[PDB]
Amino acid sequence: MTPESVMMMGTEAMKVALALAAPLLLVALITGLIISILQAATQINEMTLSFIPKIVAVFIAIIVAGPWMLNLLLDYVRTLFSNLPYIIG
Amino acid sequence: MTPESVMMMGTEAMKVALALAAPLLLVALITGLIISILQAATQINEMTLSFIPKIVAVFIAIIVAGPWMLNLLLDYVRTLFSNLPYIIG
Amino acid sequence: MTPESVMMMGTEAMKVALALAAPLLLVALITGLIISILQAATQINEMTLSFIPKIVAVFIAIIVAGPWMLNLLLDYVRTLFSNLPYIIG
Amino acid sequence: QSWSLSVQTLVFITSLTFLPAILLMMTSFTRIIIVFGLLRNALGTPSAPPNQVLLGLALFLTFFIMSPVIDKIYVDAYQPFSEQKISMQEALDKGAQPLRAFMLRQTREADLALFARLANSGPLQGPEAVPMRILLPAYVTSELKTAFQIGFTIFIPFLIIDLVIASVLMALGMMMVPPATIALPFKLMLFVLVDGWQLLMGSLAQSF
Amino acid sequence: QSWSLSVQTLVFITSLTFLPAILLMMTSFTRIIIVFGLLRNALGTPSAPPNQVLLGLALFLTFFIMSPVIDKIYVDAYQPFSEQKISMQEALDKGAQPLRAFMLRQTREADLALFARLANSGPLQGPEAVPMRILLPAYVTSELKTAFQIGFTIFIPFLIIDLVIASVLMALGMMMVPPATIALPFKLMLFVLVDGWQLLMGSLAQSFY
Amino acid sequence: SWSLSVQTLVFITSLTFLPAILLMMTSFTRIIIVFGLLRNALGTPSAPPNQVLLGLALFLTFFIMSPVIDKIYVDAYQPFSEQKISMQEALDKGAQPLRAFMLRQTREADLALFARLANSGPLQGPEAVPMRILLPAYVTSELKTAFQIGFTIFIPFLIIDLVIASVLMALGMMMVPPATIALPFKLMLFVLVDGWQLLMGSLAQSF
Amino acid sequence: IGFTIFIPFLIIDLVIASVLMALGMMMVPPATIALPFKLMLFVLVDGWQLLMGSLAQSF
Amino acid sequence: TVSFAGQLHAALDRISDRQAAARVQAEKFTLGEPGIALNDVMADMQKASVSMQMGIQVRNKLVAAYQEVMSMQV
Amino acid sequence: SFAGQLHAALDRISDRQAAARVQAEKFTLGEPGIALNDVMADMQKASVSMQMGIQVRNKLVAAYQEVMSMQV
Amino acid sequence: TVSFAGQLHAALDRISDRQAAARVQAEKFTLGEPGIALNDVMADMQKASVSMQMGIQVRNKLVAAYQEVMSMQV
Known part of the structure; x- marks a missing residue:
C-alpha cells in the first residue's frame, strides 16, 4: 500500500523483465561483436552477413534457456496474483 | 495446459520455421560472403555490390525450393489443426 | 485451387518482377562497378563518388525504357484480374 | 391450411x-x-474510399447479380401469391428453390459434407433434398474461402510494385528511405491505368 | 392521382x-x-488538418459546386410544389433530371456500359433514357477513378522533394540520416508558398466543370 | 419573438x-x-498525449476569444436582459464580433475565390461578406497560417538535426544514426530557451 | 485454442521478416508483404473447414 | 426485370388510393348523399388505417435493415 | 438559401402555434364568435406541425452526425 | 431431428387453425345455422385472440433476443 511497496513492485517486476530478456539480448550482442571482429580481421564488410548468425543464435537461445524463462515468469505471475489481496488499499 | 505441452509445441513450430527459412538465409549469406571476398581481393571500395547477387540468389532459391517449403508448411498446419481438439485435453 | 497453381501464379509474378527490375538494376550495377574499378585503379579513396553517376544512369534507364516497363506490367495485370473468375475452385 | 391474414402479416414483418x-x-x-x-x-490507403461508398457499391452489385434469382422468385412464387393463386406456405416453399439452386451452385462439396456429417443427417440422394439448415453454413464457408482466394490473388501486383521499388531504392544505397511513400503513388497509378475499379467489379460479377 | 398527405409525409421523412x-x-x-x-x-502528416475540418471544407465545396444544380431543382420542381401546381410524384420525377444530367456528364462511358450489360438492359436510345439504377453505380465508379487520378497527380511534387532531399543526403555520405523528417518541413514550404489549399480547391472546382 | 417551444428546439x-x-x-x-x-x-509522435494538446489548444482558444466573448456579452448577453434588443436583432448583433474577427484573420485571395465560386458579383463592401463565403475562406487562411507557423517551428529543430549529423560525419562516424543523439539535445534546447511560453506568446500575438 | 491458432501466422511473419532483413531490405514493412501469404496459407489448408472440424471435435 | 422501387411505388399508390376512396366516401356521406351508409364509411376508414399502419411498419423494418447494413466497417 | 428556407419553415410553425394559442386565450375569456371545435382543431394542427418540425430536425441532425463521422 | 423452425411452424399453424375455426363458427352463426350458440361463439373468438396475443408476445421476445445476440462486437 505504501509508496515504498509500490516502487518495490515496479523494481522487482522490471528486474524480472531484465532477467527474461538478458540471455537473448546478450547472446545476440556477443554474436554480433564476434562477427564484427572477424570482419575487421578479414577486411570484409557487408552489412548483411552479420544478420545471419544472429537469428540462429537467438533462436537456439530459446531452445536452451526457454524452459527456465517460462518457469520464472509463471512463478512471478502466480506469486503476484496470490499476493494481490494483501497489498490492497 | 502445462509449460511442456507448450514448450514442445513451440519447439516443433520453430523447428518448422527454421526448416522453412534455412535455404533462403543460407544462399543469401553464401552469396554475400562470396561477393565480399571477391571485392576485398581486388580492393574495390563499394557497399552496394552484393545486393543484386543477393536478390537473384534468393529469387532462384525461391523458384527451386518453393514446392518443398510450401508442402512442408501446409502439412505442419494441417496436422496442427487436426490435433487441436486433443490439445485442450 | 491446388498449391501447384499458386506456385505457377507466383512464378509468372516474380518473372514479371525480375523483368521490371533488371533494366534498372543491371545498369545501376554496371555503373557502380565501373566507377569502383576506376577508383581502385586510380587509388581515389572515396566511396560516395560512386553514388552520383548511378542515379543519372537509373534516370537514363527510365527515360529510355520507362514506357516498356509501364506497358508490360499492365499486360500482366489486365490478364490477372481477367483470370479472377477462373482460378477459384 | 392457408394462414389467416393476421398470422400472414406477423410472418411478413x-x-x-x-x-x-x-x-x-x-x-x-x-x-x-x-x-x-x-x-x-x-x-496502402486504409481509409481512402469511405465505408459507405463501398457498401453502396457492394449493395448495387449484389442487386445486379441476384436480379435473375429475384426474377425467378417473382415469376414462380411471389406473383401467384399476390394474385391469391397460392398460399403463403407454398409460395415460400416455391421461392426457396431458386435461391437454394443459386447457393448450391456456389458452394464446395467438402463443406457440405462436413456440415452433413456434423449434423448426423442420413444419406441424401442428389442435390434435390438438402435442408436449408445444412446448406446455409456450407454456403457461407464457401463464400468466405472464395473471397479470401480472390483477395490473396488481387494482392499480387501491388506486391510486385512494392518489391521492385524497394529493390531499386536499395541498389542505389538509399538505406534509410522507406518504400511505402514512393510505392503509394505508383500503386494508385497502376490501379488507375488498368481501369481497376470497373475491371474488378466485372471480374466479381463474372465469378458468380 | 396525388398522394395523400399522410403518404406524402411518410415518403418525405x-x-x-x-x-x-x-x-x-x-x-x-x-x-x-x-x-x-x-x-x-x-x-507526410497523416494527422494534418483534423478530420472534421476536412469533412466540413469538403461539404462547403460540394455545396458551392452543386449550387447551379440545387438552383435548377428549386426552380423547376420544388417551386411548383410549394406553390401547389405539382404533386409529390411529379416533383420527384422532374427534380431529378438536372441531377441526372450532372451525374451523366462526369460518368465514364465504359462503366455505364458495364452496368448496362450487367443489368441485361435493352438498347438505350440515348443518354436521356438511361435508368438511374444504371447511372448511380457507374457514376460512383467513375468518381472513384477520377479521384484516384487527381490524387496520384497531386503526389508528384512531394515525391520530387523527397527524391531531391534523399539524393542530397546520400551524395554527402550522410547515409544514416532518414530523409522523411528533413523533407517534411520543405513539403510544408512548398504547400505554403504556392498557396496549395486555394489552388487545389480551385482545381477541383474547375475539374468538375 | 416566436414561440418558446420553437426557441427551445432551435437552441438545442x-x-x-x-x-x-x-x-x-x-x-x-x-x-x-x-x-x-x-x-x-x-521526433516523438506520442510524447504529450493528444488529450493534453487538445486541452491546451482549448485554453488558448478561450483566452484568445475572450475579447470577442466580451464584445458578445456587451452587445448580446446584456441587452437581451434589458430587452432593448432581443431574438433576431441581437443574435446577429452578437455574431457581428465573430464576423469582425474572421474578416481580420482571413486573406483576400480565399474570399475572392469563394465569392467567384458563388457568383456573388455585387459584393463590393468588406463588412457585408456573407457567412457562406466567409467561413471556408477563413478556414483555408487558418490552414495556411498554421502551416507557416509549423515551418517556422521546424526551422531550428531541422538546423539542430543537420548540425548533429554533420558533426557525426566530420568526426569519422558513418553508421551512427543522428536522431538518437539529437533528440535529447532538441529537448534541452527546447526547455533551456523555454520554447513553450514564447510559443504561446507568439501565438497570442499571431491573433 | 486461440494461442495455438496464432502459431502458424507468427511463423510466417517471422520467416518473412527474417528473410527480408537478412537479404538487406530492412525498410519494408514485413506485415504488408506477409498478409497475402497468410491468406494463401489459410485458403490452401482449407482453414475454415478444418477449423470448424476442430471446434466441433473439441467437444 | 423486377425493381424494388417499382414495388414500393405500387404499394404507396395502393395505400394512397384506399385512403382517398375512404375520404371521398366519408365526404359524400357528410354531404347527405343517399346511397352511402355509415357502417360502410367506418369500416372503410378502419381498413385504410390498417393498411397505412402496415405500410408504416414495413417502412420501419426496411429503415432498420438499411441503417444496420450501412453501419458496417467493410 | 437553405438557412432561409429553414427559417421560413420555423416561422410558419411558430405562427401556427401563436394563432392557436391566441384563439384559445380569446375563447377562455368568453369572447364571442370562437367555437370550441375550431379551437381544438387548431391546437391539434399546431401540435402536428410542431411534431413534423421535430422529426425533420432529428433526421437532419442524424444525417449531419453520420456525415461528420467519416474517416476522410 | 428437432428443428426450431418446425416448432415455430407448428405453433403458427395451430394459431391459424384456432382463428379459422372461430371465424367459420361466427360465419355459420350469422347465416342462421341451427345448433350454434352465441356464448360459445364469443368464447372461441376470445380464445383465438388470446392465442394470437401469446404468439405476438413470443415473437416479440424472440426478435428482441435475436437482436441483442446479433449486435455484440466480436
Whole structure:
C-alpha cells in the first residue's frame, strides 16, 4: 500500500523483465561483436552477413534457456496474483 | 495446459520455421560472403555490390525450393489443426 | 485451387518482377562497378563518388525504357484480374 | 391450411426483420464486401474510399447479380401469391428453390459434407433434398474461402510494385528511405491505368 | 392521382434518411474528401488538418459546386410544389433530371456500359433514357477513378522533394540520416508558398466543370 | 419573438454544432495544427498525449476569444436582459464580433475565390461578406497560417538535426544514426530557451 | 485454442521478416508483404473447414 | 426485370388510393348523399388505417435493415 | 438559401402555434364568435406541425452526425 | 431431428387453425345455422385472440433476443 511497496513492485517486476530478456539480448550482442571482429580481421564488410548468425543464435537461445524463462515468469505471475489481496488499499 | 505441452509445441513450430527459412538465409549469406571476398581481393571500395547477387540468389532459391517449403508448411498446419481438439485435453 | 497453381501464379509474378527490375538494376550495377574499378585503379579513396553517376544512369534507364516497363506490367495485370473468375475452385 | 391474414402479416414483418442476415448469408454481398475491404487494404490507403461508398457499391452489385434469382422468385412464387393463386406456405416453399439452386451452385462439396456429417443427417440422394439448415453454413464457408482466394490473388501486383521499388531504392544505397511513400503513388497509378475499379467489379460479377 | 398527405409525409421523412447516401453517391463529395484523404498523405502528416475540418471544407465545396444544380431543382420542381401546381410524384420525377444530367456528364462511358450489360438492359436510345439504377453505380465508379487520378497527380511534387532531399543526403555520405523528417518541413514550404489549399480547391472546382 | 417551444428546439439544435463552431469559426484549428507540427518536429509522435494538446489548444482558444466573448456579452448577453434588443436583432448583433474577427484573420485571395465560386458579383463592401463565403475562406487562411507557423517551428529543430549529423560525419562516424543523439539535445534546447511560453506568446500575438 | 491458432501466422511473419532483413531490405514493412501469404496459407489448408472440424471435435 | 422501387411505388399508390376512396366516401356521406351508409364509411376508414399502419411498419423494418447494413466497417 | 428556407419553415410553425394559442386565450375569456371545435382543431394542427418540425430536425441532425463521422 | 423452425411452424399453424375455426363458427352463426350458440361463439373468438396475443408476445421476445445476440462486437 505504501509508496515504498509500490516502487518495490515496479523494481522487482522490471528486474524480472531484465532477467527474461538478458540471455537473448546478450547472446545476440556477443554474436554480433564476434562477427564484427572477424570482419575487421578479414577486411570484409557487408552489412548483411552479420544478420545471419544472429537469428540462429537467438533462436537456439530459446531452445536452451526457454524452459527456465517460462518457469520464472509463471512463478512471478502466480506469486503476484496470490499476493494481490494483501497489498490492497 | 502445462509449460511442456507448450514448450514442445513451440519447439516443433520453430523447428518448422527454421526448416522453412534455412535455404533462403543460407544462399543469401553464401552469396554475400562470396561477393565480399571477391571485392576485398581486388580492393574495390563499394557497399552496394552484393545486393543484386543477393536478390537473384534468393529469387532462384525461391523458384527451386518453393514446392518443398510450401508442402512442408501446409502439412505442419494441417496436422496442427487436426490435433487441436486433443490439445485442450 | 491446388498449391501447384499458386506456385505457377507466383512464378509468372516474380518473372514479371525480375523483368521490371533488371533494366534498372543491371545498369545501376554496371555503373557502380565501373566507377569502383576506376577508383581502385586510380587509388581515389572515396566511396560516395560512386553514388552520383548511378542515379543519372537509373534516370537514363527510365527515360529510355520507362514506357516498356509501364506497358508490360499492365499486360500482366489486365490478364490477372481477367483470370479472377477462373482460378477459384 | 392457408394462414389467416393476421398470422400472414406477423410472418411478413418477422421475416422483414431478418433482412440483413439474408443479405449477408444468402446473397453475394459478403464476398464482394470482403474483396473490397482487402483491396482497400492492398493499395496502402486504409481509409481512402469511405465505408459507405463501398457498401453502396457492394449493395448495387449484389442487386445486379441476384436480379435473375429475384426474377425467378417473382415469376414462380411471389406473383401467384399476390394474385391469391397460392398460399403463403407454398409460395415460400416455391421461392426457396431458386435461391437454394443459386447457393448450391456456389458452394464446395467438402463443406457440405462436413456440415452433413456434423449434423448426423442420413444419406441424401442428389442435390434435390438438402435442408436449408445444412446448406446455409456450407454456403457461407464457401463464400468466405472464395473471397479470401480472390483477395490473396488481387494482392499480387501491388506486391510486385512494392518489391521492385524497394529493390531499386536499395541498389542505389538509399538505406534509410522507406518504400511505402514512393510505392503509394505508383500503386494508385497502376490501379488507375488498368481501369481497376470497373475491371474488378466485372471480374466479381463474372465469378458468380 | 396525388398522394395523400399522410403518404406524402411518410415518403418525405423516409427519404430524409438517405441524405448521407445521396451526398456520397450523387454529389461531388466523394471526389473531394477522397482527394483530401490522399493529400494529407502526400504532405507526410497523416494527422494534418483534423478530420472534421476536412469533412466540413469538403461539404462547403460540394455545396458551392452543386449550387447551379440545387438552383435548377428549386426552380423547376420544388417551386411548383410549394406553390401547389405539382404533386409529390411529379416533383420527384422532374427534380431529378438536372441531377441526372450532372451525374451523366462526369460518368465514364465504359462503366455505364458495364452496368448496362450487367443489368441485361435493352438498347438505350440515348443518354436521356438511361435508368438511374444504371447511372448511380457507374457514376460512383467513375468518381472513384477520377479521384484516384487527381490524387496520384497531386503526389508528384512531394515525391520530387523527397527524391531531391534523399539524393542530397546520400551524395554527402550522410547515409544514416532518414530523409522523411528533413523533407517534411520543405513539403510544408512548398504547400505554403504556392498557396496549395486555394489552388487545389480551385482545381477541383474547375475539374468538375 | 416566436414561440418558446420553437426557441427551445432551435437552441438545442444549435447546441449540436458546437464542435463545428469551435473548429470553423474560432482559431482552434490553428493551435491544434501548430501543436501537431511541433510534436512532429521533436521526433516523438506520442510524447504529450493528444488529450493534453487538445486541452491546451482549448485554453488558448478561450483566452484568445475572450475579447470577442466580451464584445458578445456587451452587445448580446446584456441587452437581451434589458430587452432593448432581443431574438433576431441581437443574435446577429452578437455574431457581428465573430464576423469582425474572421474578416481580420482571413486573406483576400480565399474570399475572392469563394465569392467567384458563388457568383456573388455585387459584393463590393468588406463588412457585408456573407457567412457562406466567409467561413471556408477563413478556414483555408487558418490552414495556411498554421502551416507557416509549423515551418517556422521546424526551422531550428531541422538546423539542430543537420548540425548533429554533420558533426557525426566530420568526426569519422558513418553508421551512427543522428536522431538518437539529437533528440535529447532538441529537448534541452527546447526547455533551456523555454520554447513553450514564447510559443504561446507568439501565438497570442499571431491573433 | 486461440494461442495455438496464432502459431502458424507468427511463423510466417517471422520467416518473412527474417528473410527480408537478412537479404538487406530492412525498410519494408514485413506485415504488408506477409498478409497475402497468410491468406494463401489459410485458403490452401482449407482453414475454415478444418477449423470448424476442430471446434466441433473439441467437444 | 423486377425493381424494388417499382414495388414500393405500387404499394404507396395502393395505400394512397384506399385512403382517398375512404375520404371521398366519408365526404359524400357528410354531404347527405343517399346511397352511402355509415357502417360502410367506418369500416372503410378502419381498413385504410390498417393498411397505412402496415405500410408504416414495413417502412420501419426496411429503415432498420438499411441503417444496420450501412453501419458496417467493410 | 437553405438557412432561409429553414427559417421560413420555423416561422410558419411558430405562427401556427401563436394563432392557436391566441384563439384559445380569446375563447377562455368568453369572447364571442370562437367555437370550441375550431379551437381544438387548431391546437391539434399546431401540435402536428410542431411534431413534423421535430422529426425533420432529428433526421437532419442524424444525417449531419453520420456525415461528420467519416474517416476522410 | 428437432428443428426450431418446425416448432415455430407448428405453433403458427395451430394459431391459424384456432382463428379459422372461430371465424367459420361466427360465419355459420350469422347465416342462421341451427345448433350454434352465441356464448360459445364469443368464447372461441376470445380464445383465438388470446392465442394470437401469446404468439405476438413470443415473437416479440424472440426478435428482441435475436437482436441483442446479433449486435455484440466480436
